[PDB]
Amino acid sequence: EEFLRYLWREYLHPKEYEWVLIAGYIIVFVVALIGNVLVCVAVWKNHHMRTVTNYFIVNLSLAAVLVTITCLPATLVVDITETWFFGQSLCKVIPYLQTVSVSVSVWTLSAIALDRWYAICHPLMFKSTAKRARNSIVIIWIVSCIIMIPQAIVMECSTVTLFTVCDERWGGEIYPKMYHICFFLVTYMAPLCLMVLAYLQIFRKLWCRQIPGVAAEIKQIRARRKTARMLMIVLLVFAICYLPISILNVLKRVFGMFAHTEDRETVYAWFTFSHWLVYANSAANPIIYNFLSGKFREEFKAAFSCCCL
Ligand SMILES: Cc1ncc(OC[C@@]2(c3cccc(F)c3)C[C@H]2C(=O)Nc2ccc(F)cn2)c(C)n1
């Protein structure tokens, strides 16, 4: 019945470019799944790629796979049909997992930046242990799961031809705004500022400093320059892809914009593009790894050769 009502709605409100959205979501799904699985496989199969940065990259790819499997189809269905179709339990699950994984990814990138800063900029050049990396990953996951509990709490399937949509139901008109201010500060603003500061210091230390005399330090500097360039490009892509969705969420929840405007077409186009951009970044990270890491490129080629021959 709900599907029939969608057919009535989509007929009376015909959208021009649903097919390009479907094609883009399918391409993003396939590319993200393949690339993140290949990243995990490449790091886990070989030991020369087993670095703390690569452990954090593996955690990021695991979160990306979780989002791609559990959250991408639901987001596509909601953006196409504007209805939920999945039920109260799946609704309390899927946005919760999506927000948890977004926090996990941003704080994993922050952990990478902090470890690189400790190794490069700190006067002691700390070398992190695998125990510390695994503990950091575990605490990131636990904190992300804890802080997103109210997000899963406020998800409700409203039933307001009409449609059934799962959205955020709050008691007051102030609590959502404070919660979303905190959400924006935790997921996008503060981690991005800290990572920008850390990578600016790293860039000064690696590209604005004299070349040492010891050959081992020279090789270390070259390797760290390549890795830091890859990390900075990954951070820039992440910031670009997550800027629109975070800004739109702030404008809709905190400032209460897009409410009294009857121009839902442009607003919905921007919202669905921002939704697509998150999964697009999830798909683009492995491509960045392939095009900026020689070891990752070689291991992707090796995995392709094994799977195809
Ligand atoms: C359709 C759809 N609606 C809202 C969406 O994002 C809205 C939210 C969000 C804000 C800022 C950054 C984020 F990263 C995610 C609040 C999260 C949610 O409610 N997440 C959520 C909701 C439904 C869903 F299927 C999956 N995730 C998405 C991304 N897709």
UniProtKB/Swiss-Prot annotation:
Keywords: Cell membrane, Disulfide bond, G-protein coupled receptor, Glycoprotein, Membrane, Receptor, Transducer, Transmembrane, Transmembrane helix. The gene is HCRTR2. One of its GO terms (biological process) is chemical synaptic transmission. Residues 40-52, 115-134 are cytoplasmic. Disulfide bonds join 91-166. Belongs to the G-protein coupled receptor 1 family. Residues 1-13 are annotated as: Required for response to orexin-A. This is Orexin receptor type 2. Nonselective, high-affinity receptor for both orexin-A and orexin-B neuropeptides. Triggers an increase in cytoplasmic Ca(2+) levels in response to orexin-A binding. The chain holds residues 37 to 384 of 444 of the full protein. The record marks 8 as: Important for responses to orexin. It comes from Homo sapiens. Suvorexant binds at residue 249. GO terms for cellular component: nucleoplasm; plasma membrane; synapse. The N-terminal region is required for orexin signaling. It is found in: Cell membrane.
